């Protein structure tokens, strides 16, 4: 509570480069775990269609699978265009 303050003052007076490096590295470690945009980044990476989407053979009881790309079923990227 009082030792750490004096140590930080001495470090800022003597080695500001090391203090800045440790602060920036600590922020780089901590901040991603507390951000709601990390999930959005994962979703954006998952939304990129690198390969062809192979169609499924219609067996007759897949309601959620679309029959046309413009059909309402399937994943939606509406959350992305508003981001």
């Amino acid at each position: 509570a009082g030792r750490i303050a004096s140590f930080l003052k001495n470090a800022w007076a003597k080695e500001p480069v090391l203090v800045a490096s440790f602060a920036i590295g600590g922020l780089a470690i901590i901040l991603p775990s507390l951000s709601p945009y990390t999930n959005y980044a994962i979703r954006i990476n998952r939304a990129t269609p690198y390969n062809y989407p192979v169609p499924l053979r219609d067996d007759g009881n897949m309601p959620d699978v679309p029959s046309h790309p413009q059909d309402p079923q399937g994943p939606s990227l509406e959350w992305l265009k508003n981001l």
């Binding site: 954006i44 939304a47 990129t48 269609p49 690198y50 062809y52 989407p53 990227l77 992305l80 265009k81 981001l83």
Partner: protein, 71 residues
């Protein structure tokens, strides 16, 4: 009967001559410089965030064009 003429200082004296070191401050404070730097960094981060999200959308559109043309 000519009077004496010689190289002499002017009556009274010469004007004062400065010799002390003159190094002014001529600067801001550290807090101000750090604040401007961090503000510039934040503005740049915001701009690049918007631009990269738009770039992701454009790449998705290009990939969809390729997918439509693949068969």
């Amino acid at each position: 009967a000519s009077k004496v003429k010689q190289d002499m200082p002017p009556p009274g004296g010469y004007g004062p001559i400065d010799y002390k070191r003159n190094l002014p401050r001529r600067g801001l404070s550290g807090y101000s410089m750090f604040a401007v730097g961090i503000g510039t960094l934040l503005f740049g981060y915001w701009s690049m965030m918007k631009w990269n999200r738009e770039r992701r959308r454009l790449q998705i559109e290009d990939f969809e064009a390729r997918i439509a043309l693949m068969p």
